[PDB]
């Protein structure tokens, strides 16, 4: 399903007071957090729905007509209109604009607000993979005053937990600190509770909430529910995944000049010689070799592309040592057993994984993705299950399908004669590399092209005056490298390059 997240924000003057006016009020900074969340969701999940409500405010807005409870936006895909609506209250005097058009001061029932957000959840006609609600305050004293309403509120919250709603609470700015557990000590749905101090901290996890992460993060689904055939009949359902996948820009949309309507496009194939109109059955494909213009149908081409049925044809076992690094064709894929169609597939898969790990060999297999495709030989490397220090499976157990190139996949290169160098120069390079050595992490970079693309997208979506500029991590720290090295490069250059070498020419 999707994710249901509702940002629940008080309006009872508990967000307008500030420790100092140089620091953001508990209100406006929450607005910035929510807007950042909207942006991140736009980047990540279009199909999710998010809502924002206000309670304790003087007026109200909700179908249940529960007073002092005003929904600002309902469970919907994020929209720039919503974000700018928040922005009009974001920052200084944005809370003043709020007071002017919205106001606050009244009390509420947390039972009542829980009822309202439960109504919001019942409203959506779409399946939610998660039931998240986000509460913004620094204070639990309103219902910390009366025990009856507090008991009713906690009973309602337990009920909503029974419904599967996961309540989460944030530490908000307060001069007297959050001072937790005045009401909220066990009224929080938590999978791992570790907060019991007064927590004068003005934040709990607001840093990443404000952090603009740029990723799509599509939900997991197998790239192919293929069948692994050992010989012809020992077949198991197997799941194939692109454990990594080069992301690309969203395609452009054809819009009108004045109304920006998505333009319905149609490319008819027609006889220009007679001005008539053609049909798919009315044309024939051709390729001319030498004096012969060979004419075919496209279909005939498709069936001459038919070699093997979709599946896996095990071709044998080759030791992992027999693999050349430069023999790479296209990014590898992950292999996982599936019991959906073949039961016992996972037991056999585990047996094979352990055995290939022992004997240190790869199962070379003839692979056909789907019909009308020439099967390819691919090496399946037994991929272990790797768990981090947190025992989180960082590398799943399975197999690594690497594509084995064919004879033509290479290209003849105008090689050059082999030339050696002095071992002193080798030591110079070793020392220089040691100077410029750096620890590698998988997520160490982003595509600056796509980054600035999203930056521009956000700017126009927010109709900004000027876009934020994406930083290019891929740009080297030339000054830092010169600082690290010194004249080692000059020494090696004199060791190698005579004092007439043209750097480029």
């Amino acid at each position: 399903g999707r994710d249901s997240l509702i940002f629940l924000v008080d309006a009872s003057k508990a967000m307008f007071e500030s420790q100092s006016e140089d620091e953001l009020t508990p209100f406006d900074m929450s607005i910035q957090c929510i807007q950042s969340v909207y942006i991140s969701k736009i980047i990540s999940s279009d199909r999710d729905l998010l809502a924002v409500v206000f309670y304790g405010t003087e007026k109200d807005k909700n179908s249940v007509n529960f007073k002092n409870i005003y929904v600002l936006q309902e469970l919907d895909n994020p929209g720039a209109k919503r974000i700018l609506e928040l922005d009009q209250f974001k920052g200084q005097q944005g809370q003043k604009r709020f007071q002017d058009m919205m106001g606050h001061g009244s009390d509420y029932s947390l039972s009542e607000v829980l009822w309202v957000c439960a109504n919001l959840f019942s409203d959506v006609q779409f399946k939610m993979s998660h039931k998240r609600i986000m509460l913004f305050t620094n204070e639990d004293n309103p219902h910390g005053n009366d025990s009856a309403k507090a008991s009713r509120a906690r009973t309602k919250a337990g009920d909503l937990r029974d419904t599967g709603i996961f309540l989460d609470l944030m530490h908000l700015k307060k001069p007297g600190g959050f001072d937790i557990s005045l009401f909220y000590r066990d009224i929080i749905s938590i999978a791992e509770d570790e907060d019991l101090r007064v927590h004068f901290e003005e934040s709990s996890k607001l840093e990443d909430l404000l952090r603009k992460v740029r990723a799509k993060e599509t939900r997991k689904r197998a790239l192919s529910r293929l069948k692994l055939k050992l010989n012809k009949d020992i077949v198991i359902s197997v799941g194939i995944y692109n454990l990594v996948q080069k992301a690309l820009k969203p395609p452009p949309i054809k819009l009108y000049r004045e109304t920006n309507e998505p333009v319905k496009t149609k490319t008819r194939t027609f006889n220009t010689s007679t001005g008539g109109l053609l049909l798919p059955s009315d044309t024939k494909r051709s390729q001319i070799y030498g004096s012969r213009q060979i004419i075919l149908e496209k279909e005939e081409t498709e069936e001459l592309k038919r070699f093997d049925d979709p599946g896996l044809m095990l071709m044998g076992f080759k030791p992992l040592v027999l693999l050349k690094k430069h023999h790479y064709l296209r990014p590898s894929l992950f292999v996982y057993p599936e019991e959906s169609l073949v039961i016992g597939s996972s037991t056999l898969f585990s047996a094979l994984l352990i055995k290939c790990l022992e004997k240190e060999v790869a199962a070379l297999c003839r692979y056909t993705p789907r019909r009308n495709i020439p099967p390819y030989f691919v090496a399946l490397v037994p991929q272990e299950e790797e768990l981090d220090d947190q025992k989180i499976q960082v590398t799943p157990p399975g197999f690594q399908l690497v594509f084995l190139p064919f004879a033509d996949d290479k290209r003849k290169m105008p090689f050059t004669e082999k030339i050696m160098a002095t071992p002193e120069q080798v030591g110079k390079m070793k020392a220089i590399v040691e100077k410029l050595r750096f620890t590698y992490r998988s997520d160490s970079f982003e595509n600056p092209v796509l980054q600035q693309h999203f930056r521009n997208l956000e700017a126009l979506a927010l109709d900004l005056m000027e876009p934020e500029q994406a930083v290019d991590l891929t740009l080297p720290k030339v000054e830092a490298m010169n600082k690290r090295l010194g004249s080692l490069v000059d020494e090696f250059k004199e060791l190698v390059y005579p004092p007439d070498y043209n750097p480029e020419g």
Binding site: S40, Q390, F438, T439, L473
Partner: peptide, 23 residues
């Protein structure tokens, strides 16, 4: 939940991008 992006439930925590860090 530990080791999970609370922004994207069911998705692991997203580290800051970072860059080259000489050793």
């Amino acid at each position: 939940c530990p080791g999970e992006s609370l922004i994207n439930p069911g998705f692991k925590s997203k580290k800051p991008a970072g860059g080259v860090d000489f050793d």
